[PDB]
Amino acid sequence: AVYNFATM
Amino acid sequence: IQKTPQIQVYSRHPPENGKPNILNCYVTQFHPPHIEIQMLKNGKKIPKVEMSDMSFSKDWSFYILAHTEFTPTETDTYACRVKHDSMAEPKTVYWDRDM
Amino acid sequence: GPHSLRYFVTAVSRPGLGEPRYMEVGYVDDTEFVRFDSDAENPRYEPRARWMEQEGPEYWERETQKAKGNEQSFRVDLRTLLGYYNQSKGGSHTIQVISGCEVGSDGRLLRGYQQYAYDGCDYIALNEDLKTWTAADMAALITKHKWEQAGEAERLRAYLEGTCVEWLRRYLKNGNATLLRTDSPKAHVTHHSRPEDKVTLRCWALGFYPADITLTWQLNGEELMELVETRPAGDGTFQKWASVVVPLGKEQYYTCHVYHQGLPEPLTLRW
Numbered sequence: 001a002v003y004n005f006a007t008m
Numbered sequence: 009i010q011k012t013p014q015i016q017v018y019s020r021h022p023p024e025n026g027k028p029n030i031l032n033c034y035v036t037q038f039h040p041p042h043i044e045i046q047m048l049k050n051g052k053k054i055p056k057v058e059m060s061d062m063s064f065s066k067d068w069s070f071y072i073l074a075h076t077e078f079t080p081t082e083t084d085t086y087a088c089r090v091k092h093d094s095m096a097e098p099k100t101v102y103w104d105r106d107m
Numbered sequence: 108g109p110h111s112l113r114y115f116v117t118a119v120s121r122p123g124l125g126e127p128r129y130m131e132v133g134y135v136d137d138t139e140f141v142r143f144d145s146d147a148e149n150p151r152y153e154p155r156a157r158w159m160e161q162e163g164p165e166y167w168e169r170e171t172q173k174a175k176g177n178e179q180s181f182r183v184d185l186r187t188l189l190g191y192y193n194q195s196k197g198g199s200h201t202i203q204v205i206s207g208c209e210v211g212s213d214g215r216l217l218r219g220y221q222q223y224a225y226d227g228c229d230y231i232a233l234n235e236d237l238k239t240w241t242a243a244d245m246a247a248l249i250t251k252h253k254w255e256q257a258g259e260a261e262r263l264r265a266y267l268e269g270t271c272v273e274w275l276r277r278y279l280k281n282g283n284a285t286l287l288r289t290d291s292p293k294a295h296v297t298h299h300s301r302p303e304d305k306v307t308l309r310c311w312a313l314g315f316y317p318a319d320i321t322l323t324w325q326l327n328g329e330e331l332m333e334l335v336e337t338r339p340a341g342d343g344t345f346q347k348w349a350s351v352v353v354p355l356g357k358e359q360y361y362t363c364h365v366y367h368q369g370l371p372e373p374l375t376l377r378w
Binding site for chain 2: 132
């Protein structure tokens, strides 16, 4: 299951 | 920063006339990712080609597989045509069954 | 052996043609098993491996909405990075992400990774320690600073050490028959003429899984060579080839060797 990605 | 696709055409199995096989066109080492890939039977596009196995490498270049179920005959000829922004013209790589 | 869960993530702006294209493609080891594509008819996570049909509606809903959040998140990054790099707002750009964990055969974490690239150049990556970031340039520092201040490494470490590993275990177990299998290479050698009086000897390996393999040519002991990167054959197995140019009339002194997880003794063949 993928991670919830952060913004940059 | 723009990388030219490498286009390799090849069947899953050693080709034998009359035997179901899979034809593959692996389009590799390209950037930008926007790309067009048509597989062709006797100059005519093959419908229902599957796009699979999309990945990238260390250098971040794109890799993707186009493939389709086919039954080779002696007369038929197969190619893969790719339009990518790094190429003046659309490059057709033909399937070489003796390769 | 050790195994991997990998997500390849790509967001691609298309200014004038609408919203960025968003793709997430997941692999266990060398096998594609999941995919989301924002350009699909009605975008949602879908199985790419038969064994993933086991997973229920809740899984697909949870991954899909995660997917749709990320799509938005990368939407913002693309706009953010234009700022970071003082870039025009009319060109197409790419963000790429490699995110995943490897485990050993005891099912424990060997390695976690998460690496970003903007327009095909490195931007930022989790370091091996799983607490600090390495930024490829001045832009990436700004991002770095946000993730440090927001504690993203520690949230990412919970994922690489917890969520990522436990789901890899789940998938291996759920897809044992496909993922823990080994198919062995069948090899054969092909002959081509040239000028002036030379010969291309090409060694094929076919039908093998996992993707890992080694092909070498030899002139009586010493290893020698054009090749192609090992490559998927459309059914979940892989192939490769390696060729040498030899003298016409000396073909018999060259042999091809094939080493693979599925060959107890490596193969030896010649034209």
